[PDB]
Ligand binder design. Structure first.
Ligand SMILES: *[C@@H]1O[C@H](CO)[C@@H](O[C@@H]2O[C@H](CO)[C@@H](O[C@@H]3O[C@H](CO)[C@@H](O)[C@H](O)[C@@H]3O)[C@H](O)[C@H]2NC(C)=O)[C@H](O[C@@H]2O[C@@H](C)[C@@H](O)[C@@H](O)[C@@H]2O)[C@H]1NC(C)=O
Ligand SMILES: *[C@@H]1O[C@H](CO)[C@@H](O[C@@H]2O[C@H](CO)[C@@H](O[C@@H]3O[C@H](CO)[C@@H](O)[C@H](O)[C@@H]3O)[C@H](O)[C@H]2NC(C)=O)[C@H](O[C@@H]2O[C@@H](C)[C@@H](O)[C@@H](O)[C@@H]2O)[C@H]1NC(C)=O
Ligand SMILES: *[C@@H]1O[C@H](CO)[C@@H](O[C@@H]2O[C@H](CO)[C@@H](O)[C@H](O)[C@H]2NC(C)=O)[C@H](O[C@@H]2O[C@@H](C)[C@@H](O)[C@@H](O)[C@@H]2O)[C@H]1NC(C)=O
Ligand SMILES: *[C@@H]1O[C@H](CO)[C@@H](O[C@H]2O[C@H](CO)[C@@H](O)[C@H](O)[C@H]2NC(C)=O)[C@H](O[C@@H]2O[C@@H](C)[C@@H](O)[C@@H](O)[C@@H]2O)[C@H]1NC(C)=O
Ligand SMILES: OC[C@H]1O[C@H](O[C@@H]2[C@@H](O)[C@@H](O)O[C@H](CO)[C@@H]2O)[C@H](O)[C@@H](O)[C@H]1O
Ligand SMILES: OC[C@H]1O[C@H](O[C@@H]2[C@@H](O)[C@@H](O)O[C@H](CO)[C@@H]2O)[C@H](O)[C@@H](O)[C@H]1O
Ligand code: CA
Ligand code: CA
Ligand code: MN
Ligand code: MN
Lengths: 237, 237
């Protein structure tokens, strides 16, 4: 069948969401993935937000895989240009009941200790050793070393519209990033076999992180706000 | 091996373009694919515009296929809502030195008594027998019976931004359609093996058509204007 939900905005204490670590919902309705005190983003922050109920992406009985579409708006404000904002945010799919991973360039979804599979779309703002120039969009499968990336220029503090679509029949994951105020459009796509990397049931959500203390730079930070979010999935099984 | 060009606007008899049939460039810089007299689009019109120089999409020696990206803005104004606007416009790739094909639902790129291969992205406004609900975006390979389609709502007379990207390593052709004034975003993608359908050298361009006389409806028309166009291709050969 078809599952779906839509958050035109976030109401404090959402029954539908699971907030982890620093993730909070502000009084004015936005989902702040990372810590922001008195209007200022801090470093050493990591937070995630998961849809409370698990979604079935595939069925072992029929062998069918779900197709899905998710749309959301986010905003990244980088108050301090030098030396380097960090780290970025991702939309991810992972097994249910996982714990926040390592922060920094791992966005809180990768745990070197005990790794769990995941498919994520990253909006990377800090160039780690494994990264190409930033900012860039990346498609991540079980790792933060993207299978494909594309550069983009951030609209600092502006709103961004993202469209992520997965077509099971072609196994194509296509993502579109648009900054309405600048009129710019970025597109990236890759082939991903969900059935091969993920279990039948998963959690969908966001995760973000600011500068890791090991970098010794308190300015390595920015906001990671989610303004709205809609999700739809169809499993003919 | 990189080839690219950019047209922020179009000038009268540009050396870089090959205009065919009704295609003409207006005094105010727009590329009008189909006939418009005294601000009114007419039926029974067909026109194409090709980049004057051929581009190499693949090399028989190395076996490599080119990756490319093209961006353009177009506008479709439909003055007569009833009974039905027609027919639409396409961005296409075909062998060099082709002639305008049949008009109507064939957009001027398909010639029944001398079919040549082609890959095209259509913005279809008239529902032929082989079509799903209109308007819709479609990916066409050697035929106007799309391999994939997606519906969209036209911003009548408004501007549309299109991004077409082809990644040779994955064979994915992804297209994004955005109507800035409405803030709507449409995305479609499919797998296409250029090397399998097209020759090493091709022409890239646009083609459009208005109502065919056989429909006996003079209102079966609309404008098909191209405002800007940039193209880039890389052959690692
Ligand atoms: C960490 O991030 C902070 C906040 O941006 C940086 O501090 C700021 O450094 C600016 C230097 O580009 C200062 O700008 C000056 O502003 C005044 C008035 O606004 C002008 O007259 C002058 O020409 C400059 O444009 C800005 O005042 C300062 N902000 C504050 C209140 O601290 C900081 O920069 C670096 O460290 C600070 C402590 C100073 O030593 C700066 O000179 C230095 O660039 C960022 N730190 C890092 C690691 O780069
Ligand atoms: C072909 O396209 C023309 C142009 O739109 C159609 O004629 C137009 O028909 C409209 C009927 O829907 C007329 O609209 C009405 O206009 C008056 C005053 O302008 C308003 O008060 C009223 O609220 C409607 O908006 C429109 O005036 C007319 N345009 C002109 C100047 O001719 C045409 O429709 C066909 O002919 C007209 C004259 C009527 O007989 C219609 O019933 C008839 O369908 C379109 N023809 C086809 C094949 O549909
Ligand atoms: C649709 O437009 C065509 C123009 O490309 C018309 O054909 C052209 O008509 C010219 C004068 O009518 C003639 O000099 C051209 O040789 C001819 N070109 C072609 C494609 O052969 C076409 O038909 C014309 O108009 C209709 C009404 C009849 O009068 C025909 O005898 C004309 O050729 C136009 N179709 C219709 C039905 O309007
Ligand atoms: C980065 O953020 C951490 C929060 O997770 C800070 O440590 C806190 O959490 C750890 C384990 O989760 C606890 O053991 C600490 O008691 C917590 N500290 C606080 C603020 O109450 C962490 O702070 C640093 O490390 C901890 C272990 C203490 O030594 C703090 O004094 C120290 O500042 C913070 N890192 C930095 C450098 O800001
Ligand atoms: O400053 C923020 C960043 O901190 C870390 O980056 C590394 C750091 O671990 C250390 O190896 O030193 C180098 C510079 O020599 C970098 O700062 C995180 O790994 C980054 O993701 C980022 O948070
Ligand atoms: O009226 C515009 C359309 O005219 C033609 O469509 C067909 C027509 O040829 C004839 O077969 O009758 C049917 C309806 O019974 C349609 O009108 C073109 O083929 C279309 O592309 C369009 O121009
Ligand atoms: Ca990074
Ligand atoms: Ca059609
Ligand atoms: Mn990255
Ligand atoms: Mn069609």
């Amino acid at each position: 069948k078809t599952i779906s939900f839509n958050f035109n905005q976030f109401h404090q204490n959402e029954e539908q969401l699971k907030l982890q670590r620093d993730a909070r919902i502000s009084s004015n309705s936005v989902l702040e993935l990372t810590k922001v005190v008195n209007g200022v983003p801090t470093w050493n922050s990591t937070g995630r937000a998961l849809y409370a109920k698990p979604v079935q992406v595939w069925d072992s009985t029929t062998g069918n895989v779900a197709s899905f579409e998710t749309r959301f708006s986010f905003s990244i404000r980088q108050p301090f240009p030098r030396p380097h904002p960090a780290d970025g945010l991702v939309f991810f799919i992972a097994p249910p009941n996982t714990q926040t991973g390592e922060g920094g360039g791992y966005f809180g979804i990768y745990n070197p200790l005990s790794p769990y599979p995941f498919v994520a779309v990253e909006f990377d703002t800090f160039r780690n050793t494994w990264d190409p120039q930033i900012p860039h969009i990346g498609i991540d499968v079980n790792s933060v070393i993207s299978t494909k990336t594309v550069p983009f220029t951030l609209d600092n503090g502006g709103i961004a519209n993202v469209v992520i679509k997965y077509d099971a029949s072609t196994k194509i994951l296509h993502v579109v990033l648009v900054f309405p105020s600048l009129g710019t459009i970025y597109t990236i796509a890759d082939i991903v076999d969900l059935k091969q990397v993920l279990p039948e049931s998963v959690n969908v959500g966001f995760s973000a992180a600011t500068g890791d203390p090991s970098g010794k730079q308190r300015n390595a930070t920015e906001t990671h706000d989610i303004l709205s979010w809609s999700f739809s999935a169809s499993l003919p099984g």
